[PDB]
Symmetry: C2
Subunit: 109 residues, 2 copies
């Protein structure tokens, strides 16, 4: 696996996540976007930013993409998640839906 | 290949390089450290910072570690370098020498 395997926009998500870059992260999602993570659903870019800020304070995590497959408007990324949280590190699937050069949806499972 | 395959300190180098993080980068090298790159030698943390800043302006590059092997105090990392420069992208070997949880030397070839 290699970065270049990812759609530019998914790559921008992880760079921003990894560099704690709020601006870049905010510009990554559609205005109407949804994130489902940790038993919950966050709709709209405001809720998504709230969600991303809390998860950083809660665990100071690193998400590292390990492999990927792109199927249509969907991109599926396995990522090693590592940090201050019970059971660390754990491997997760990030399923991204891309509408119009932005992220419309992201399910973390 | 995976981040955890790298010594913590080598990983700090690439995270900082990647996030344009000058503080973190400066604290990565020994005071007496040397970087050899692009036909030239930079000694001391001041020269190293100068070198890192000019290269970022020159090419806005991304260095992405692809694989690694550790042998003794030495760590050898193949990295895909990508950017605004002739012949991009190119694969390079970063040879790091580690003395006391810092980098004493880095040769890029």
């Amino acid at each position: 696996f290699q970065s270049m395997d990812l759609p530019d926009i998914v790559n921008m998500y992880f760079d921003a996540d990894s560099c704690n870059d709020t601006d870049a992260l905010s510009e990554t999602f559609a205005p109407d976007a949804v994130v489902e993570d940790e038993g919950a659903r966050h709709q709209g870019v405001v809720a998504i930013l709230r969600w991303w800020v809390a998860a950083k304070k809660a665990a100071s995590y690193v998400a590292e993409p390990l492999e990927s497959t792109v199927d249509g408007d969907k991109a599926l990324v396995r990522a090693k998640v590592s940090g201050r949280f019970p059971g660390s590190p754990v491997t997760l699937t990030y399923s991204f839906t891309i509408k119009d050069g932005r992220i419309a949806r992201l399910e973390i499972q």
